[PDB]
């Protein structure tokens, strides 16, 4: 089999997270840059590491992969994490409220509010799944 | 000799397929069951005990039965398959499936398919002991 052992996997992962800038996709370039930036004490192992880093870039070019925490993808992800909509989803003009929760609100000293549209409760008491 | 009436229609007989685990029967008879057209088992086709209930013997018997029915006028059959029944096993033997498929595949037409194995409202003791059979 062609299963890549922990040595080549770990080396390729650390290589791709540290110098993602220089590394690309074409095996010749990955091999060259891998020799340039990594002190690999074999040539066969160097080719194995370059091949796995090429595979990992084929992985990253089509989405994020959990093994690596590159600066660019994490920067984009955190940018997505400060996303805020123009209008808050809690700014509902009308909220549909059942009789029991409006009774609670009246007992909560919040009964003067007119946003809560008292709805018609469901007349069926079927809410548990059948047994069998 | 035979019914040559209404050639464009089907003539119906009934086959009683007794597919025991010992051997299999293919018994085509009159629709009322009183008059028997032809019976071939799995034992008169093969000279071996283990192949008596084999699918090969059942297929041979079914082909012979279909040939005799075709030559004797009958064109379609109602299947009434049955296992040993009684207090003994209720599962039809290996010959039922092959015999029925061979009857279908040998120029015959299948009518109504029924299972008529005996099922007691409750039975007597089986041939084993209270500890079963131990081989």
């Amino acid at each position: 089999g062609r299963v890549r052992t922990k040595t080549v996997k770990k080396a390729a992962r650390v290589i791709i997270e540290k110098y993602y800038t220089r590394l690309g996709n074409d095996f010749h370039t990955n091999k060259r840059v891998c020799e340039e930036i990594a002190i690999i004490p074999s040539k066969k192992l160097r080719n194995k590491i370059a091949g796995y880093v090429t595979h990992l870039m084929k992985r990253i070019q089509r989405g994020p992969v959990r093994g690596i925490s590159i600066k660019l993808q994490e920067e984009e992800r955190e940018r997505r994490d400060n996303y805020v909509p123009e209008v808050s989803a809690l700014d509902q003009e009308i909220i549909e409220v059942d009789p029991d929760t409006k009774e609670m609100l009246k007992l909560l000293d919040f009964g003067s509010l007119s946003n809560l549209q008292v709805t018609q409760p469901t007349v069926g008491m079927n809410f548990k799944t059948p047994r069998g | 000799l035979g019914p040559q009436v209404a050639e464009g229609e089907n003539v119906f007989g009934v086959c009683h397929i007794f597919a025991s685990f010992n051997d299999t029967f293919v018994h085509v008879t009159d629709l009322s069951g009183k008059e028997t057209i032809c019976r071939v088992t799995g034992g008169m086709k093969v000279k071996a005990d283990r192949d008596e209930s084999s699918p090969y013997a059942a297929m041979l018997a079914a082909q012979d039965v279909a040939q005799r029915c075709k030559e004797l006028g009958i064109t379609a059959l109602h299947i009434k398959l049955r296992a040993t029944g009684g207090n003994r096993t209720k599962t039809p033997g290996p010959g039922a499936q092959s015999a029925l498929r061979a009857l279908a595949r040998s120029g015959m037409k299948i009518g109504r398919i029924e299972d008529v194995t005996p099922i007691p409202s409750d039975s007597t003791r089986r041939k084993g002991g209270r500890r079963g059979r131990r081989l």
Binding site: - | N87, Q97, A104, K109, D115, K127, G128, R131, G132
Partner: protein, 99 residues
């Protein structure tokens, strides 16, 4: 030691349960202890459906089914691989296999 909390049977709150006979050996096994399967198969196997359907007099006949209730003693049910021995923790599981 006590392998099972129900002793491998379904007898609670009664003294005697009528026995049945294993479908293979005819062993006397209590009806609650016996392993019961309910096979609902086609009278015609899926391989032989096409021939009998083609040779059928009645279009859209829907072939009948074989309904069999099979009782097994523990020995025969183990040998026939219907049930298997399970780990001490997986023994307690009562959910039937998802199939």
């Amino acid at each position: 030691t006590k392998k099972r909390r129900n002793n491998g049977r379904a007898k609670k709150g009664r003294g005697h349960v009528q026995p049945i006979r294993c479908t293979n050996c005819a062993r006397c096994v209590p009806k609650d202890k016996a392993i019961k399967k309910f096979v609902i198969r086609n009278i015609v196997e899926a391989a032989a459906v096409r021939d009998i359907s083609e040779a059928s007099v009645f279009d859209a006949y829907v072939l009948p089914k074989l309904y069999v209730k099979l009782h097994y003693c523990v020995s025969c049910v183990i040998h026939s691989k219907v049930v298997r021995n399970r780990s001490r923790e997986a023994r307690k599981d009562r959910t039937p296999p998802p199939r």
